[PDB]
Amino acid sequence: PGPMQTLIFFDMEATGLPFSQPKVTELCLLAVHRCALESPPPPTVPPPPRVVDKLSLCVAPGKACSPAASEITGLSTAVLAAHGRQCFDDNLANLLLAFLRRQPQPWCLVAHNGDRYDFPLLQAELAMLGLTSALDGAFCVDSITALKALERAKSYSLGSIYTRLYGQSPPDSHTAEGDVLALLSICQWRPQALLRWVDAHARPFGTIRPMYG
Amino acid sequence: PGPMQTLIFFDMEATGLPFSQPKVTELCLLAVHRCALESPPTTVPPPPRVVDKLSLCVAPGKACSPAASEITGLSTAVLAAHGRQCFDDNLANLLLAFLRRQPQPWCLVAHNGDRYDFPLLQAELAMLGLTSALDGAFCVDSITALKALERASSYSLGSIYTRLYGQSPPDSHTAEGDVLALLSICQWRPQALLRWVDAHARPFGTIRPMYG
DNA sequence: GTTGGCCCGGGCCATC
DNA sequence: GTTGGCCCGGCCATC
């Protein structure tokens, strides 16, 4: 496995915490080519690359959001149904894959605390559709682990890292797209160091076990 | 047809003006359920909380004209540096699957769409042999719409935006920036726009391709 | 850097 | 509203 050709920054919102077997309510993928981070007065926050692919979607979960999640995310099952949202079905999996197929391979998903939430949860959704092997060619990285390594070479939530790095809070927190753009900014802090950490720790996604599947 | 259930605001960037047989370099679709326009929430309007957004860069067959690169900040060598792929079958299936997530009838909204975004998109699909893919959708030129809304009450995207809101829109001359600025404008009188679009939603299949 | 509809033959303008 | 893991018995971190 060589250098990752595309970094796909990734975040989801869901009906609750892992023990509740949550269902996806919102997702965002932002695919960035390696050269945007290998060869990017100066601003405090790095400007996102001009050439990006972005996909943001709301998802009808099969059940009610927990009250705490509705409060944090601004999404509820009833409102999603009012906007006619469809559930996490086969067409959505085909959509995700068609988006990824626009990106040079190898792919590396990047998600904040991904190993405990975003990655198992996506794998659960795909597993329930029998598409457990649809992302087997992909790689993934947890940006909390990466940022710990980069910083040491204290809270590590997305908000705390952003503010510690950039001295201000990111806009539109606790949305899938807002948290993805914030994550992009954090990873653009020392982009070279991050690319070398990703290349050395890119984990096959097929080894991510479903959260509840 | 009845009430359009989904307005998909739409902009593309490309290599040049219509005379040069331009090729798409960037596109953005932003689908908004009509209920986000009929009963909005409680000075630019905030976008709806619930939206679907697709934004992509495309490798064109040819070079970008010098002015188009200046305006858009895209060039054909740079798109190749980012390993962008051409307008192909997969991309056509991408757009169709994204539209499948939206309730029908669909209506595309595009600024000066009757003369650029719509025929350019139709031409790309026609070179792929896919000239009937998006024909179940409707389309509406927001210049025609906004002219009538101010009539009963320059028409470039920037001039409209500054007239209603007073400041310049951010990220102008990108596909997403243009779409987001278009959304904000269409949220000025969302009630009257919905009635307008419903009264003048035109089948996408009545649009002839820009070339080929 | 254009030119095909829109305003009101022809000049203006809007997409990139 | 917190489980399950980590930074080095406490206390986060994704919703």
mmCIF file with all atom_site columns, N, CA and C (backbone and C1' of nucleotides) in Angstrom, chain A residues 11 13-14 73 113 116-117 152 155-156 158 179, chain D residues 1-8 12-15:
data_model
loop_
_atom_site.group_PDB
_atom_site.id
_atom_site.type_symbol
_atom_site.label_atom_id
_atom_site.label_alt_id
_atom_site.label_comp_id
_atom_site.label_asym_id
_atom_site.label_entity_id
_atom_site.label_seq_id
_atom_site.pdbx_PDB_ins_code
_atom_site.Cartn_x
_atom_site.Cartn_y
_atom_site.Cartn_z
_atom_site.occupancy
_atom_site.B_iso_or_equiv
_atom_site.pdbx_formal_charge
_atom_site.auth_seq_id
_atom_site.auth_comp_id
_atom_site.auth_asym_id
_atom_site.auth_atom_id
_atom_site.pdbx_PDB_model_num
ATOM 1   N N     . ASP A 1 11  ? -17.818 12.897 8.469  1.00 0.00 ? 11  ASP A N     1
ATOM 2   C CA    . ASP A 1 11  ? -18.521 12.946 9.747  1.00 0.00 ? 11  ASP A CA    1
ATOM 3   C C     . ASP A 1 11  ? -19.986 12.593 9.543  1.00 0.00 ? 11  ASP A C     1
ATOM 4   N N     . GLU A 1 13  ? -23.964 12.419 11.732 1.00 0.00 ? 13  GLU A N     1
ATOM 5   C CA    . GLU A 1 13  ? -24.828 12.600 12.892 1.00 0.00 ? 13  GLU A CA    1
ATOM 6   C C     . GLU A 1 13  ? -25.829 11.453 12.920 1.00 0.00 ? 13  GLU A C     1
ATOM 7   N N     . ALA A 1 14  ? -26.275 11.091 14.120 1.00 0.00 ? 14  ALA A N     1
ATOM 8   C CA    . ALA A 1 14  ? -27.086 9.898  14.305 1.00 0.00 ? 14  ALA A CA    1
ATOM 9   C C     . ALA A 1 14  ? -28.042 10.134 15.464 1.00 0.00 ? 14  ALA A C     1
ATOM 10  N N     . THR A 1 73  ? -28.028 18.192 17.731 1.00 0.00 ? 73  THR A N     1
ATOM 11  C CA    . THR A 1 73  ? -27.859 18.184 16.284 1.00 0.00 ? 73  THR A CA    1
ATOM 12  C C     . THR A 1 73  ? -28.864 19.054 15.546 1.00 0.00 ? 73  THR A C     1
ATOM 13  N N     . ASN A 1 113 ? -12.574 10.826 16.140 1.00 0.00 ? 113 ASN A N     1
ATOM 14  C CA    . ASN A 1 113 ? -12.989 9.683  16.953 1.00 0.00 ? 113 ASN A CA    1
ATOM 15  C C     . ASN A 1 113 ? -13.608 8.604  16.068 1.00 0.00 ? 113 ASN A C     1
ATOM 16  N N     . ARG A 1 116 ? -14.265 4.850  17.117 1.00 0.00 ? 116 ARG A N     1
ATOM 17  C CA    . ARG A 1 116 ? -15.321 4.512  18.064 1.00 0.00 ? 116 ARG A CA    1
ATOM 18  C C     . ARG A 1 116 ? -16.714 4.865  17.573 1.00 0.00 ? 116 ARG A C     1
ATOM 19  N N     . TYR A 1 117 ? -16.842 5.666  16.519 1.00 0.00 ? 117 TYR A N     1
ATOM 20  C CA    . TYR A 1 117 ? -18.189 6.059  16.137 1.00 0.00 ? 117 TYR A CA    1
ATOM 21  C C     . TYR A 1 117 ? -18.406 6.025  14.629 1.00 0.00 ? 117 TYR A C     1
ATOM 22  N N     . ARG A 1 152 ? 2.038   16.058 20.038 1.00 0.00 ? 152 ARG A N     1
ATOM 23  C CA    . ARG A 1 152 ? 3.093   15.678 20.971 1.00 0.00 ? 152 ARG A CA    1
ATOM 24  C C     . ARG A 1 152 ? 4.472   15.599 20.322 1.00 0.00 ? 152 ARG A C     1
ATOM 25  N N     . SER A 1 155 ? -7.818  18.309 26.434 1.00 0.00 ? 155 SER A N     1
ATOM 26  C CA    . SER A 1 155 ? -8.938  17.748 25.687 1.00 0.00 ? 155 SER A CA    1
ATOM 27  C C     . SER A 1 155 ? -8.638  17.647 24.198 1.00 0.00 ? 155 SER A C     1
ATOM 28  N N     . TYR A 1 156 ? -9.058  16.536 23.594 1.00 0.00 ? 156 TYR A N     1
ATOM 29  C CA    . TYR A 1 156 ? -8.859  16.331 22.165 1.00 0.00 ? 156 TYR A CA    1
ATOM 30  C C     . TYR A 1 156 ? -10.179 16.209 21.413 1.00 0.00 ? 156 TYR A C     1
ATOM 31  N N     . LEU A 1 158 ? -13.112 17.843 18.959 1.00 0.00 ? 158 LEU A N     1
ATOM 32  C CA    . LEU A 1 158 ? -12.928 18.674 17.773 1.00 0.00 ? 158 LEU A CA    1
ATOM 33  C C     . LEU A 1 158 ? -12.924 20.150 18.142 1.00 0.00 ? 158 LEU A C     1
ATOM 34  N N     . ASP A 1 179 ? -18.806 19.996 11.034 1.00 0.00 ? 179 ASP A N     1
ATOM 35  C CA    . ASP A 1 179 ? -17.729 19.255 11.691 1.00 0.00 ? 179 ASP A CA    1
ATOM 36  C C     . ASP A 1 179 ? -16.697 18.743 10.691 1.00 0.00 ? 179 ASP A C     1
ATOM 37  P P     . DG  D 2 1   ? -30.186 14.140 32.935 1.00 0.00 ? 1   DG  D P     1
ATOM 38  O "O5'" . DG  D 2 1   ? -29.716 12.610 32.784 1.00 0.00 ? 1   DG  D "O5'" 1
ATOM 39  C "C5'" . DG  D 2 1   ? -28.592 12.280 31.970 1.00 0.00 ? 1   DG  D "C5'" 1
ATOM 40  C "C4'" . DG  D 2 1   ? -28.947 11.196 30.960 1.00 0.00 ? 1   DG  D "C4'" 1
ATOM 41  C "C3'" . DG  D 2 1   ? -27.778 10.311 30.537 1.00 0.00 ? 1   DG  D "C3'" 1
ATOM 42  O "O3'" . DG  D 2 1   ? -27.785 9.114  31.306 1.00 0.00 ? 1   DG  D "O3'" 1
ATOM 43  C "C1'" . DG  D 2 1   ? -28.730 11.341 28.624 1.00 0.00 ? 1   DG  D "C1'" 1
ATOM 44  P P     . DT  D 2 2   ? -26.539 8.751  32.254 1.00 0.00 ? 2   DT  D P     1
ATOM 45  O "O5'" . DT  D 2 2   ? -25.490 8.076  31.263 1.00 0.00 ? 2   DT  D "O5'" 1
ATOM 46  C "C5'" . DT  D 2 2   ? -25.851 6.943  30.489 1.00 0.00 ? 2   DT  D "C5'" 1
ATOM 47  C "C4'" . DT  D 2 2   ? -24.617 6.321  29.848 1.00 0.00 ? 2   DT  D "C4'" 1
ATOM 48  C "C3'" . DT  D 2 2   ? -23.411 6.138  30.780 1.00 0.00 ? 2   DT  D "C3'" 1
ATOM 49  O "O3'" . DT  D 2 2   ? -22.702 4.962  30.419 1.00 0.00 ? 2   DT  D "O3'" 1
ATOM 50  C "C1'" . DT  D 2 2   ? -22.772 7.420  28.945 1.00 0.00 ? 2   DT  D "C1'" 1
ATOM 51  P P     . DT  D 2 3   ? -22.987 3.543  31.118 1.00 0.00 ? 3   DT  D P     1
ATOM 52  O "O5'" . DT  D 2 3   ? -22.438 2.504  30.030 1.00 0.00 ? 3   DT  D "O5'" 1
ATOM 53  C "C5'" . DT  D 2 3   ? -23.108 2.388  28.778 1.00 0.00 ? 3   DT  D "C5'" 1
ATOM 54  C "C4'" . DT  D 2 3   ? -22.128 2.199  27.623 1.00 0.00 ? 3   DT  D "C4'" 1
ATOM 55  C "C3'" . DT  D 2 3   ? -21.075 1.119  27.809 1.00 0.00 ? 3   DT  D "C3'" 1
ATOM 56  O "O3'" . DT  D 2 3   ? -20.897 0.461  26.585 1.00 0.00 ? 3   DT  D "O3'" 1
ATOM 57  C "C1'" . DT  D 2 3   ? -20.018 3.234  27.488 1.00 0.00 ? 3   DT  D "C1'" 1
ATOM 58  P P     . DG  D 2 4   ? -20.216 -0.988 26.518 1.00 0.00 ? 4   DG  D P     1
ATOM 59  O "O5'" . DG  D 2 4   ? -18.683 -0.664 26.260 1.00 0.00 ? 4   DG  D "O5'" 1
ATOM 60  C "C5'" . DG  D 2 4   ? -18.304 -0.140 25.020 1.00 0.00 ? 4   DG  D "C5'" 1
ATOM 61  C "C4'" . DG  D 2 4   ? -16.975 0.570  25.113 1.00 0.00 ? 4   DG  D "C4'" 1
ATOM 62  C "C3'" . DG  D 2 4   ? -15.790 -0.298 25.540 1.00 0.00 ? 4   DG  D "C3'" 1
ATOM 63  O "O3'" . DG  D 2 4   ? -14.825 -0.220 24.517 1.00 0.00 ? 4   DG  D "O3'" 1
ATOM 64  C "C1'" . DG  D 2 4   ? -15.797 1.787  26.665 1.00 0.00 ? 4   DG  D "C1'" 1
ATOM 65  P P     . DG  D 2 5   ? -13.497 -1.112 24.531 1.00 0.00 ? 5   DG  D P     1
ATOM 66  O "O5'" . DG  D 2 5   ? -12.337 -0.029 24.673 1.00 0.00 ? 5   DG  D "O5'" 1
ATOM 67  C "C5'" . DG  D 2 5   ? -12.167 0.948  23.655 1.00 0.00 ? 5   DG  D "C5'" 1
ATOM 68  C "C4'" . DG  D 2 5   ? -11.472 2.178  24.201 1.00 0.00 ? 5   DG  D "C4'" 1
ATOM 69  C "C3'" . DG  D 2 5   ? -10.015 1.964  24.612 1.00 0.00 ? 5   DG  D "C3'" 1
ATOM 70  O "O3'" . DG  D 2 5   ? -9.159  2.626  23.693 1.00 0.00 ? 5   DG  D "O3'" 1
ATOM 71  C "C1'" . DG  D 2 5   ? -11.235 3.313  26.192 1.00 0.00 ? 5   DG  D "C1'" 1
ATOM 72  P P     . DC  D 2 6   ? -7.569  2.447  23.801 1.00 0.00 ? 6   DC  D P     1
ATOM 73  O "O5'" . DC  D 2 6   ? -7.091  3.772  24.557 1.00 0.00 ? 6   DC  D "O5'" 1
ATOM 74  C "C5'" . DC  D 2 6   ? -7.366  5.043  23.990 1.00 0.00 ? 6   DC  D "C5'" 1
ATOM 75  C "C4'" . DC  D 2 6   ? -7.045  6.160  24.964 1.00 0.00 ? 6   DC  D "C4'" 1
ATOM 76  C "C3'" . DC  D 2 6   ? -5.590  6.207  25.426 1.00 0.00 ? 6   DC  D "C3'" 1
ATOM 77  O "O3'" . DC  D 2 6   ? -5.152  7.548  25.472 1.00 0.00 ? 6   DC  D "O3'" 1
ATOM 78  C "C1'" . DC  D 2 6   ? -6.996  6.137  27.289 1.00 0.00 ? 6   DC  D "C1'" 1
ATOM 79  P P     . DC  D 2 7   ? -3.626  7.901  25.139 1.00 0.00 ? 7   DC  D P     1
ATOM 80  O "O5'" . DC  D 2 7   ? -3.568  9.501  25.250 1.00 0.00 ? 7   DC  D "O5'" 1
ATOM 81  C "C5'" . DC  D 2 7   ? -4.667  10.227 25.819 1.00 0.00 ? 7   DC  D "C5'" 1
ATOM 82  C "C4'" . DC  D 2 7   ? -4.305  10.804 27.182 1.00 0.00 ? 7   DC  D "C4'" 1
ATOM 83  C "C3'" . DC  D 2 7   ? -2.801  10.929 27.470 1.00 0.00 ? 7   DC  D "C3'" 1
ATOM 84  O "O3'" . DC  D 2 7   ? -2.563  12.071 28.308 1.00 0.00 ? 7   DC  D "O3'" 1
ATOM 85  C "C1'" . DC  D 2 7   ? -3.762  9.641  29.120 1.00 0.00 ? 7   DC  D "C1'" 1
ATOM 86  P P     . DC  D 2 8   ? -1.063  12.575 28.609 1.00 0.00 ? 8   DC  D P     1
ATOM 87  O "O5'" . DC  D 2 8   ? -0.870  12.398 30.201 1.00 0.00 ? 8   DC  D "O5'" 1
ATOM 88  C "C5'" . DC  D 2 8   ? -1.013  11.112 30.841 1.00 0.00 ? 8   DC  D "C5'" 1
ATOM 89  C "C4'" . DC  D 2 8   ? 0.319   10.374 30.940 1.00 0.00 ? 8   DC  D "C4'" 1
ATOM 90  C "C3'" . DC  D 2 8   ? 0.413   9.100  30.107 1.00 0.00 ? 8   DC  D "C3'" 1
ATOM 91  O "O3'" . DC  D 2 8   ? 0.957   9.386  28.831 1.00 0.00 ? 8   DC  D "O3'" 1
ATOM 92  C "C1'" . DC  D 2 8   ? 0.951   8.597  32.356 1.00 0.00 ? 8   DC  D "C1'" 1
ATOM 93  P P     . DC  D 2 12  ? -12.140 15.762 31.673 1.00 0.00 ? 12  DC  D P     1
ATOM 94  O "O5'" . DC  D 2 12  ? -13.025 16.120 30.385 1.00 0.00 ? 12  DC  D "O5'" 1
ATOM 95  C "C5'" . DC  D 2 12  ? -13.722 15.089 29.675 1.00 0.00 ? 12  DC  D "C5'" 1
ATOM 96  C "C4'" . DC  D 2 12  ? -12.788 14.332 28.739 1.00 0.00 ? 12  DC  D "C4'" 1
ATOM 97  C "C3'" . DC  D 2 12  ? -13.311 14.150 27.324 1.00 0.00 ? 12  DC  D "C3'" 1
ATOM 98  O "O3'" . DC  D 2 12  ? -12.230 13.892 26.433 1.00 0.00 ? 12  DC  D "O3'" 1
ATOM 99  C "C1'" . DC  D 2 12  ? -13.346 12.072 28.430 1.00 0.00 ? 12  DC  D "C1'" 1
ATOM 100 P P     . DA  D 2 13  ? -11.903 14.913 25.236 1.00 0.00 ? 13  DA  D P     1
ATOM 101 O "O5'" . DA  D 2 13  ? -12.873 14.460 24.049 1.00 0.00 ? 13  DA  D "O5'" 1
ATOM 102 C "C5'" . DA  D 2 13  ? -12.438 13.482 23.090 1.00 0.00 ? 13  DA  D "C5'" 1
ATOM 103 C "C4'" . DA  D 2 13  ? -13.625 12.750 22.477 1.00 0.00 ? 13  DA  D "C4'" 1
ATOM 104 C "C3'" . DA  D 2 13  ? -14.817 13.634 22.134 1.00 0.00 ? 13  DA  D "C3'" 1
ATOM 105 O "O3'" . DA  D 2 13  ? -14.712 14.069 20.796 1.00 0.00 ? 13  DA  D "O3'" 1
ATOM 106 C "C1'" . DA  D 2 13  ? -15.506 11.587 23.211 1.00 0.00 ? 13  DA  D "C1'" 1
ATOM 107 P P     . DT  D 2 14  ? -15.843 15.000 20.137 1.00 0.00 ? 14  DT  D P     1
ATOM 108 O "O5'" . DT  D 2 14  ? -16.793 13.961 19.396 1.00 0.00 ? 14  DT  D "O5'" 1
ATOM 109 C "C5'" . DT  D 2 14  ? -16.224 13.013 18.495 1.00 0.00 ? 14  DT  D "C5'" 1
ATOM 110 C "C4'" . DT  D 2 14  ? -17.257 11.988 18.077 1.00 0.00 ? 14  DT  D "C4'" 1
ATOM 111 C "C3'" . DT  D 2 14  ? -18.666 12.522 18.031 1.00 0.00 ? 14  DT  D "C3'" 1
ATOM 112 O "O3'" . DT  D 2 14  ? -18.920 13.104 16.734 1.00 0.00 ? 14  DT  D "O3'" 1
ATOM 113 C "C1'" . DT  D 2 14  ? -18.569 10.379 19.129 1.00 0.00 ? 14  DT  D "C1'" 1
ATOM 114 P P     . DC  D 2 15  ? -20.210 14.045 16.503 1.00 0.00 ? 15  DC  D P     1
ATOM 115 O "O5'" . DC  D 2 15  ? -21.410 13.000 16.652 1.00 0.00 ? 15  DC  D "O5'" 1
ATOM 116 C "C5'" . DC  D 2 15  ? -22.592 13.434 17.129 1.00 0.00 ? 15  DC  D "C5'" 1
ATOM 117 C "C4'" . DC  D 2 15  ? -23.619 12.331 17.147 1.00 0.00 ? 15  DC  D "C4'" 1
ATOM 118 C "C3'" . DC  D 2 15  ? -25.015 12.860 17.384 1.00 0.00 ? 15  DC  D "C3'" 1
ATOM 119 O "O3'" . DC  D 2 15  ? -25.708 12.920 16.145 1.00 0.00 ? 15  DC  D "O3'" 1
ATOM 120 C "C1'" . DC  D 2 15  ? -24.403 11.404 19.151 1.00 0.00 ? 15  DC  D "C1'" 1
#
